[PDB]
Design a protein around this ligand. Sequence first.
Ligand SMILES: O=c1c2ncn3c2ncn1[C@@H]1O[C@H](COP(=O)(O)OP(=O)(O)OCC2O[C@@H]3[C@H](O)C2O)[C@@H](O)[C@H]1O
Length: 252
Amino acid sequence: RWRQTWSGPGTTKRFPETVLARCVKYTEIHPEMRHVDCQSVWDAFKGAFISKHPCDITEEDYQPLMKLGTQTVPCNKILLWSRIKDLAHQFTQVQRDMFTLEDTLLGYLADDLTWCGEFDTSKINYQSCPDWRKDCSNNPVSVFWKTVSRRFAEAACDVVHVMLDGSRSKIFDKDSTFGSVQVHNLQPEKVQTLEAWVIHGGREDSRDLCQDPTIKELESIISKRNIQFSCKNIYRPDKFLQCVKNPEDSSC
Ligand SMILES: O=c1c2ncn3c2ncn1[C@@H]1O[C@H](COP(=O)(O)OP(=O)(O)OCC2O[C@@H]3[C@H](O)C2O)[C@@H](O)[C@H]1O
């Protein structure tokens, strides 16, 4: 107990009860998911990683879960994000203008949780789980997010929006889930434009960050996919959120 197996945090306490409860809550609230059997969902989620080496997980392990979690999302209202999840969520919560991954049954089930199992034992590992960097990238949590994030990108059509954190060293980060998985799985046949909203953290008075080298990079990558690119600065996200809640506002 003075040295754990893995370098990452262990499985969230009460993980099984938490996931099952989340599934119940989501399916009570969202009527199109009203039929989903939540025991079946939990069984499939378990099936992905229980009794498996937590450095040997594949997208295949998650297919029963992905199937049970099949859900239509309005394809033209998708909001992607990188390193700025709270603003993304606060924004969609005002009046459901857009949908993030966390607004789907599967995103909702897993948000903020950690989980892993052990090879040749059916026990959940509450003590530690693999770190993506130090231990392995093919771990239960990372493989889950990669799979669901890919599928979410594949669902998009028309204008897709992305919120980016303009206070970061790399506003667009090629190594992020957004940059390494989602940008490459938008379907050029279906997606007309990717519109980036660069969210300032430099509080008030700041530059045109749509000119940032990494933004030019993003523009290049997506342009070469035959998708148009658009960018906007959000200089004061506090004002932005206020204008979303009350666009009948003078300052707006
Ligand atoms: O929805 C999630 C999500 N919820 C929780 N997490 C998510 N990751 C990716 N996504 C999807 O990818 C991106 C965000 O991932 P990121 O680019 O690595 O940002 P980021 O680096 O802020 O996301 C970090 C992050 O937080 C966990 C996951 O363990 C992970 O990699 C969004 O567009 C989502 O659609």
